[PDB]
Each structure stands twice: as structure tokens, then as C-alpha cells.
Coordinates of C-alpha atoms (C1' of nucleotides) in Angstrom, one line a residue:
Chain A
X1 CA -4.3 -39.6 -9.8
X2 CA -6.3 -37.2 -11.8
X3 CA -3.6 -35.4 -13.9
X4 CA -4.0 -31.7 -13.6
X5 CA -4.3 -30.0 -17.0
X6 CA -4.1 -26.2 -17.3
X7 CA -4.7 -24.5 -20.6
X8 CA -2.1 -21.6 -20.7
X9 CA -3.0 -20.3 -24.1
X10 CA -5.6 -20.6 -27.0
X11 CA -4.4 -18.2 -29.7
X12 CA -6.1 -17.7 -33.0
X13 CA -3.6 -17.3 -35.9
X14 CA -4.0 -17.0 -39.7
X15 CA -2.0 -17.3 -42.9
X16 CA -3.1 -15.4 -46.0
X17 CA -3.6 -17.1 -49.4
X18 CA -4.6 -15.9 -52.8
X19 CA -8.2 -16.6 -51.8
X20 CA -8.2 -14.6 -48.6
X21 CA -7.0 -15.5 -45.1
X22 CA -7.2 -18.9 -43.5
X23 CA -7.6 -19.1 -39.7
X24 CA -6.3 -21.7 -37.3
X25 CA -5.9 -22.3 -33.6
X26 CA -2.8 -22.9 -31.5
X27 CA -3.2 -24.3 -27.9
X28 CA -0.3 -24.3 -25.4
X29 CA -1.0 -26.7 -22.6
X30 CA 0.7 -27.9 -19.3
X31 CA -0.1 -31.2 -17.7
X32 CA 1.2 -32.6 -14.4
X33 CA 0.9 -35.6 -12.1
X34 CA 0.6 -33.2 -9.1
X35 CA 3.3 -35.2 -7.3
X36 CA 6.6 -34.3 -9.1
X37 CA 5.9 -35.0 -12.8
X38 CA 5.1 -32.2 -15.2
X39 CA 5.2 -31.5 -18.9
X40 CA 4.1 -29.1 -21.6
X41 CA 2.6 -29.6 -25.0
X42 CA 1.8 -27.5 -28.1
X43 CA -1.0 -28.2 -30.5
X44 CA -2.2 -26.7 -33.8
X45 CA -5.3 -27.3 -35.7
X46 CA -8.0 -25.7 -37.8
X47 CA -10.4 -25.6 -34.8
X48 CA -10.1 -25.1 -31.1
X49 CA -11.1 -28.5 -29.8
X50 CA -8.8 -30.4 -32.0
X51 CA -6.0 -28.1 -31.2
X52 CA -6.6 -28.6 -27.5
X53 CA -6.7 -32.4 -27.9
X54 CA -3.4 -32.3 -29.9
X55 CA -1.7 -30.2 -27.2
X56 CA -2.9 -32.6 -24.5
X57 CA -1.4 -35.5 -26.4
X58 CA 1.9 -33.8 -27.0
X59 CA 2.1 -32.7 -23.4
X60 CA 1.7 -36.3 -22.2
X61 CA 5.0 -37.1 -23.8
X62 CA 7.3 -34.4 -22.3
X63 CA 6.7 -35.6 -18.7
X64 CA 9.8 -35.1 -16.6
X65 CA 10.7 -35.7 -12.9
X66 CA 11.2 -32.6 -10.8
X67 CA 12.3 -33.4 -7.2
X68 CA 10.0 -31.5 -4.9
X69 CA 10.7 -31.1 -1.2
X70 CA 7.8 -31.4 1.2
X71 CA 5.8 -29.2 -1.2
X72 CA 8.4 -26.7 -2.2
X73 CA 11.6 -26.5 -4.1
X74 CA 15.1 -27.0 -2.6
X75 CA 16.6 -23.7 -3.6
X76 CA 16.2 -20.4 -5.4
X77 CA 16.5 -20.8 -9.2
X78 CA 16.5 -18.5 -12.2
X79 CA 15.3 -19.8 -15.5
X80 CA 16.3 -17.9 -18.7
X81 CA 14.6 -18.9 -21.9
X82 CA 14.9 -16.6 -24.9
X83 CA 13.9 -13.4 -23.2
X84 CA 11.7 -14.5 -20.4
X85 CA 13.5 -14.5 -17.1
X86 CA 11.8 -16.3 -14.2
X87 CA 13.0 -16.0 -10.6
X88 CA 11.6 -18.8 -8.4
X89 CA 12.3 -18.9 -4.7
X90 CA 11.0 -21.5 -2.1
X91 CA 9.2 -20.0 0.9
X92 CA 8.2 -20.8 4.4
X93 CA 5.1 -23.1 4.6
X94 CA 1.6 -21.8 4.1
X95 CA 2.7 -18.8 2.1
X96 CA 1.0 -20.0 -1.1
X97 CA 2.0 -19.9 -4.7
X98 CA 2.9 -16.3 -5.2
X99 CA 3.3 -16.5 -9.0
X100 CA 1.9 -15.1 -12.2
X101 CA -0.4 -16.9 -14.5
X102 CA 1.7 -19.5 -16.4
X103 CA 4.1 -19.9 -13.4
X104 CA 1.2 -20.7 -11.1
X105 CA -0.3 -23.1 -13.6
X106 CA 2.8 -25.1 -14.0
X107 CA 3.5 -25.0 -10.3
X108 CA 0.1 -26.3 -9.2
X109 CA 0.4 -29.0 -11.9
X110 CA 3.8 -30.0 -10.5
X111 CA 2.6 -30.1 -6.9
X112 CA 4.6 -27.3 -5.4
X113 CA 2.7 -25.4 -2.7
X114 CA 4.8 -22.5 -1.3
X115 CA 7.0 -20.3 -3.5
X116 CA 7.6 -16.7 -4.4
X117 CA 8.4 -15.9 -7.9
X118 CA 8.8 -13.0 -10.3
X119 CA 8.6 -12.8 -14.1
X120 CA 11.1 -10.4 -15.5
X121 CA 11.6 -9.7 -19.1
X122 CA 9.2 -10.9 -21.8
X123 CA 5.7 -11.9 -20.5
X124 CA 4.9 -14.2 -23.5
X125 CA 3.2 -17.0 -21.7
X126 CA 4.6 -19.8 -23.7
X127 CA 8.2 -18.6 -23.3
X128 CA 7.6 -18.1 -19.6
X129 CA 6.5 -21.7 -19.2
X130 CA 9.6 -22.8 -21.1
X131 CA 11.8 -20.7 -18.9
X132 CA 10.2 -22.3 -15.9
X133 CA 11.2 -25.6 -17.3
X134 CA 14.8 -24.5 -17.8
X135 CA 14.8 -23.5 -14.1
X136 CA 13.5 -27.1 -13.5
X137 CA 16.6 -28.3 -15.3
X138 CA 18.8 -26.1 -13.0
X139 CA 17.3 -27.5 -9.8
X140 CA 19.4 -30.1 -7.9
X141 CA 18.9 -32.9 -5.5
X142 CA 20.8 -33.6 -2.3
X143 CA 21.6 -37.3 -2.5
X144 CA 23.2 -37.0 -6.0
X145 CA 25.1 -33.8 -5.4
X146 CA 26.4 -35.4 -2.2
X147 CA 27.2 -38.7 -4.0
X148 CA 29.1 -36.7 -6.7
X149 CA 30.9 -34.5 -4.2
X150 CA 32.0 -37.5 -2.1
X151 CA 30.1 -36.5 1.0
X152 CA 27.0 -37.6 3.0
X153 CA 24.0 -35.4 3.8
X154 CA 25.0 -35.0 7.4
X155 CA 28.7 -34.4 6.5
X156 CA 27.7 -31.9 3.9
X157 CA 27.2 -29.6 6.8
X158 CA 29.6 -31.5 9.0
Chain B
rA1 C1' 15.4 -39.3 1.9
rA2 C1' 17.7 -35.1 5.4
rA3 C1' 19.3 -30.4 8.5
rU4 C1' 19.0 -25.2 9.2
rA5 C1' 17.6 -20.5 7.7
rA6 C1' 14.2 -17.5 5.1
rC7 C1' 7.9 -15.3 7.7
rG8 C1' 8.6 -12.1 1.8
rA9 C1' 8.2 -10.6 -4.6
rA10 C1' 1.3 -12.5 -9.1
rG11 C1' -0.2 -10.1 -13.7
rA12 C1' -2.9 -8.0 -18.1
rG13 C1' -4.5 -5.0 -22.5
rU14 C1' -2.3 -2.6 -26.8
rU15 C1' 2.0 -1.7 -33.1
rU16 C1' 0.8 -7.0 -37.2
rG17 C1' -3.1 -10.3 -42.3
rA18 C1' -0.6 -13.4 -38.4
rU19 C1' 4.4 -14.1 -35.2
rC20 C1' 8.8 -13.1 -31.9
rC21 C1' 11.6 -9.2 -29.8
rU22 C1' 12.3 -4.1 -28.5
rG23 C1' 9.4 -0.1 -26.6
rG24 C1' 6.0 3.7 -24.7
rC25 C1' 1.0 4.3 -23.0
rU26 C1' -3.0 2.2 -20.0
rU27 C1' -4.9 -1.1 -16.1
rA28 C1' -6.3 -4.3 -11.1
rG29 C1' -3.6 -2.2 -5.2
rA30 C1' -2.3 0.8 -1.1
rA31 C1' -2.7 6.1 0.5
rC32 C1' -4.2 12.0 1.3
rU33 C1' -5.3 17.7 6.3
rA34 C1' -8.7 16.2 0.2
rA35 C1' -12.8 18.3 -3.2
rC36 C1' -17.3 17.1 -6.1
rG37 C1' -21.8 13.9 -7.3
rC38 C1' -25.8 10.3 -5.3
rU39 C1' -27.4 8.7 -0.6
rG40 C1' -27.2 9.2 4.7
rG41 C1' -28.6 5.8 11.7
rC42 C1' -25.5 6.0 16.0
rA43 C1' -21.0 5.8 19.1
rG44 C1' -15.6 6.2 20.2
rU45 C1' -10.9 8.4 18.8
rG46 C1' -8.3 11.6 15.8
rC47 C1' -8.5 15.6 12.2
rG48 C1' -10.6 20.2 10.1
rU49 C1' -8.4 27.9 5.5
rC50 C1' -3.2 23.0 1.7
rU51 C1' -5.1 29.4 -1.6
rU52 C1' -4.3 35.9 -0.1
rA53 C1' 2.5 36.2 5.1
rA54 C1' -4.6 39.5 1.8
rG55 C1' -7.7 43.4 4.7
rC56 C1' -10.0 43.0 9.4
rA57 C1' -16.3 44.9 13.4
rU58 C1' -16.5 43.1 18.1
rG59 C1' -15.3 40.1 23.0
rC60 C1' -11.4 37.8 25.5
rA61 C1' -6.2 35.8 25.5
rA62 C1' -0.9 38.7 31.6
rG63 C1' -1.2 39.8 35.5
rU64 C1' -0.1 39.4 40.7
rC65 C1' 1.9 41.2 45.7
rA66 C1' -2.2 45.7 50.9
rA67 C1' 2.6 40.9 55.4
rA68 C1' 7.6 46.8 50.6
rC69 C1' 6.1 52.2 51.3
rG70 C1' 3.7 56.9 51.7
rG71 C1' -1.5 58.6 50.7
rG72 C1' -6.9 59.2 49.0
rA73 C1' -11.9 57.1 49.9
rU74 C1' -15.4 54.1 53.0
rG75 C1' -17.4 51.3 57.4
rU76 C1' -16.6 50.4 62.6
rA77 C1' -14.1 51.9 67.5
rG78 C1' -12.8 57.2 68.0
rC79 C1' -13.8 63.7 70.5
rA80 C1' -9.7 64.1 66.9
rA81 C1' -5.8 61.2 66.0

RNA sequence: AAAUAACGAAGAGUUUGAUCCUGGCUUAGAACUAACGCUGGCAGUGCGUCUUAAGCAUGCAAGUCAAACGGGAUGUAGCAA
């Protein structure tokens, strides 16, 4: 189903040697099924196209299931990676993905449709994506939490 | 799987040979009793000395009561009253 692929970053880096300085390309990439599966990948190469391909291949291995809810997330989460804090909050329908660059990329790849978000702290795009994925770790699902708390979905409110 | 509530929060450039973090500066927006530059058809509504509480030609902006009173003047009746 036409896996969405969004190129977050294509940075050009270098290391110096006795001869001079040698250049290289790093590509940070997010792929997603669009229906609950999403993953990210990092690639490095001597040229942009090979770096892009490597990042794609790496991303296709870190696919993980995130339980979406009718096109949004069950509850407000805060993802803290190293210094990138990302607050994500589900919203009433038809609001639209109110998110920055990397957050919007990962969200449309995931399939979410209607959230608000804010990127506090560092704006390093790669760290922001990783913080978003930590928030994905923090998100829950109703049946399991109810099965581990010894309740049932109706009883969980009464 | 679900229920209810929420009717609303977007980033980016820039320290380095390159990187992360800290950090300031700058930037896309909405405004004003605005001014200036180029250009300029109309209508409706609203607004129009933010500075010298500086000096001011001119005209107007607080008068009315004759059924409160004694008189003057005028016209008529009146010889005069």
C-alpha cells in the first residue's frame, strides 16, 4: 500500500585527512505504512543517492506498530529524547496535523490525521524524530491496559 | 475493538574542517488614530494635530419669558387718555 517515504534530512559532512578534506553524505529517512506501522533509518555514503538508498533500507527494518485510533492518538504524550522534547496531543476531527517538519513527516507516514504538537528544546530534526518515537513507546492501548488492570472497557468507566 | 471530553499549540537560518549541546541575533504571522515611495475606479461604514497644555485674524457656539412689572417708541381706534 504504497509506503510513504519522507526524507527528513540530507546533510553533507566531511572529515579531514593529510591530503585535504573528504566529503560524504548522511541521509535521515522515515518510512511508514500509512496505517499504523512506521520506522526510521539512517544512511551514510560518499554520494547522496547511495546514502538515500541506504537510509531507506535501514528504515525498512525498524518498522513498529503504533496503535492509531480512528486517525488520531489515544492520549496526550510527551517524548523526551536527548534534548528534544515533543508534546503531542490528539485533537477533534478535521483539525489537521498541526506539527513541525519532522513531526508532520513521521505523522503522515504513520497515518495519524488530527493532532496538535509542539517541539520544545532542541530542534535538531533527527533528535526530534527519535523523541517522537519515544513518545510512540509511551502511548498505550485500551484492551491491554484493561486486561492488565483486571477490568473491561465498559467497566473501566463503570 | 470501545465510551466521553477537548473545537486549540507548525517552523527555519546562523558559532565548526565537520558534529552534538548551550546561547544570542534574525526570519515567515497578526496589528496601529500611522508616515513615506510607486500607482490609483466607485460605493458603504468608521476614523482623521499621537508633536507646542505653543501663539492666535475672523464668524458662530446661551439664551428665553410681553400671560411678572412700570415705561419709551410705532401703527390702528382715540379729541386726549
